[model samples]
Target chain A: LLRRPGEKTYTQRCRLFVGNLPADITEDEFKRLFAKYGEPGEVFINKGKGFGFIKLESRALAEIAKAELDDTPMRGRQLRVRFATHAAALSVRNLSPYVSNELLEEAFSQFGPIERAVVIVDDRGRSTGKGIVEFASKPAARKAFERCSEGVFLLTTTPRPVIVEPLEQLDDEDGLPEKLAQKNPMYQKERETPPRFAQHGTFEYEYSQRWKSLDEMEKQQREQVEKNMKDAKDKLESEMEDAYHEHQANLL
Target chain B: EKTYTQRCRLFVGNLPADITEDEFKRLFAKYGEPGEVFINKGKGFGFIKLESRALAEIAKAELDDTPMRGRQLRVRFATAALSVRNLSPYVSNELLEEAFSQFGPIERAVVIVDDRGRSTGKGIVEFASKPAARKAFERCSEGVFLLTTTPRPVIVEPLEQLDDEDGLPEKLAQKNPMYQKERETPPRFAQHGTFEYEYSQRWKSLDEMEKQQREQVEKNMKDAKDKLESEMEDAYHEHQANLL
Candidate 1:
């Protein structure tokens, strides 16, 4: 839920979804056809749905397979091969206590198009350690689930695995609860002080003032050090001049 | 010429002369547990047998042309039949078929491609009848060049016939007659008939002609600039006289 800088919304893909697979086709037969391109990672087929996913070792190999096999006839049936998409909604759990709703949305967006992602919070505005992410398409949701299943949803510095599953239905509202609204940057009240000013009537104003006063004191201390250095230099010059005069008298 | 099933063996060439059998074994073991590692030290090449043909193929795709001991490895299906090498990377299976099909029907024509789907500059063209293969060899031995690309000398020769009972001889199989014939053939760049020859000849001259045209254009630009400057200078003097 804590949106880290530069974290993408969803996983960029090399996995492929193949539909209209022949019911008689076995994993070995499917692998034999795809093995011509490269070694596939893992292949899953749902016999009832007549659809499955084949994860290739790399994107280039997936592209080659897709280009060669898309709409290609196999066992009297045409197979459709395209980038894998996920379900429309997901049930995500074991979220970090520090996860924010915005962070959840940002992390889930990279897999595919996002409808909304919400991190549920309790009465005290703390995360309930569970959430839901809804993608625009089933494929998007499915991709997020598969990738996040491999523990890709780590948003905090310390890594903890999160559980992601497809939701049978999306009954929850798209927005976060009102009690947690203050955590969102958009919903939070704007401080009376403008951003351009160093001192603002914000809750964290003491922090700003503390740093400001420390900067002034350091500047004053640096000037005092400089003045003392000049005084030392002048005194040294006068002592050197007097010594040279004494040496001249001694020579005389 | 003899034909043998390729099976799970791979031809590994361009190996460093000092490469030991143990070193080769260690390197190839990354792909799969190698069945055998036969290094022809004199020839600077070797043959590797993987656990399965699929493993051999994957190894070939992933490791071919890869650097080993500062030498680029040349890996291919070790076929005991007529094989072609030093082909242009642009040459494809269909193009190779068109070139060899004139003599006889090809049993199979495969231009070996690497994992990235780029040609490996080597391929195998199989013929059902040895007579048909000899015919293509006789004609193509002189060399065959597909039009409009850099012409590479295609070295066509039969691979060593695999011995069934005793296995490969220590001395290695004697060079086939096609190997000598391939050596005798002249290194001709033009092979796509007289029209293509004329085109190539003209292509070289075109570069010189383009250079001449570029110089002519530069000369014309300079002349125009000088003429305009002179005329403008004269006009300015005339205006001065009128003011006077």
Candidate 2:
């Protein structure tokens, strides 16, 4: 691997998983906006549903997109963008909430002290009521998924309905916008001044969650780079004392 | 089992937009017919596929370093996805074209760059035919490193000796161990609600709208996973699907 004058040891690409999009936003519209950063491969936009996935071609570009334009405005609403995980795209509605661990135990206890059961939820913190109740065997959980598939009242008097989708691989290619069916980044512009040197070294770019404000840390880092560069030059001059001595001896 | 239909992704870096399909077809006519050419308008790279291995080899031999415009060509076989060591930060259409045009008329040589004009550093470069990508990967890549490292550090030596031989400068080497702090994993999506069904009902008044919305949300969530999995799987499935 070759190193750029100012670049990190490795690059970072982030997969964005977006949910709760306005019904009208198409995958094509998304590509039109995101392709400005990089070519988005495999866009899945569900019009009836409100979400999609935008995978940039490279990690460097992905990070740029994530940092610069995850929830960028289009049609008035800001879109959310982040590094998507496998669980997010699995289509499993996490409804782990509303149904308490105690309630889940009470309900599925008859089947067994349900090893683990969770309701599906989304990144937006809404419950879909689609949950998983693991019984000792597939027959047990599958039975639970079937029984509670649409039933309202069970062990509890709440009557909260639930849906249980069978475990299957998510189909990514289905429902992509036709405009994106061709080569995307079909619309793009050159970024004249990329911040490639900003995070090249070890000292600055601290992304610790504990660090409350990144702006302050970044400012401190700019100062640090300047100080370190000067320190390095001074150190070099001091180390070259032998070279200076050798030149004087030649003159003698 | 590794299926041997032998699919290879050929990246034609540094291509010229002015170069058209017929032009590529005529140039790569030797590699058993070059595949489709994908040329990004402002971007330089594109993609091409070939029919068979032998034809791909023939094409790579003649096309790998053929120059176009002001740049010398840099042909490389693309991996399924990006890894830390190989990711390029800012891959523009111009750079893509400059690298790939030597391999006889590239149809599509795309490098997915992000919004900030930095290279996602990974992309699917399709050739008109599968054979062409395979040949470009095999025969062409072994030729040379796209970015050559020089002075070839053959042995570990004192800085002073090296300084004397290659100009002059001796100093303490800085030990920079880039330790990134822990990133907090995101919170779980759902939490148990305080209220019971007596009050918490999103679509109780209308069953029709309720069912519709519920189904839609479920589908949307799964669809999102599908897109992420497809992209991630192609790169990671070799050891992942079974375990996952």
Best by DockQ: 2
Report the lDDT tens digits of candidate 1 across residue range A98-120: 55556567767788878567676
Question: Model 2's CAPRI class?
Answer: incorrect
Clash count in backbone of candidate 1:
16
In angstroms, the error of model 2 at B241 is 53
Q: After superposing candidate 2, which stretches have Cα over 4 Å from the reference?
A: A1-98, A119-130, A155-157, A167-252, B1-244
Tell me the spans in candidate 1 whose CA falls farther than 4 Å from its real position. Answer: A1-252, B1-5, B80-244
DockQ of 1: 0.01
RMSD to truth, every model: 33.2, 29.0
Query: Quality of candidate 1's docking, in CAPRI categories?
Result: incorrect
For model 2 the local lDDT of residue A239 reads 44
lDDT for each residue of candidate 2 in B134-153, tens digit (9 for 90 to 100):
54444322232131111000
What tens digits encode model 2's per-residue C-alpha lDDT throughout A1-252? 122312221111235776667778866777886867645666778778777777665444555566556556767778776555333211123233344333444556454324444444343333344544444345555555554443333332223333345554322211122233233342233223221211212121121111213323444545555565456544544444444452354552
Alpha-carbon lDDT, every model = 0.57, 0.41
B1-244, model 1: which lDDT tens digit per residue? Answer: 2122245678889999799988888877776566767889999899887765446656775577678888889887775246776554545565565666776866556666553444566677777567888876665544332311232335567644332211222223233563343234222224333322333333334433544555555465445533543454453332235663
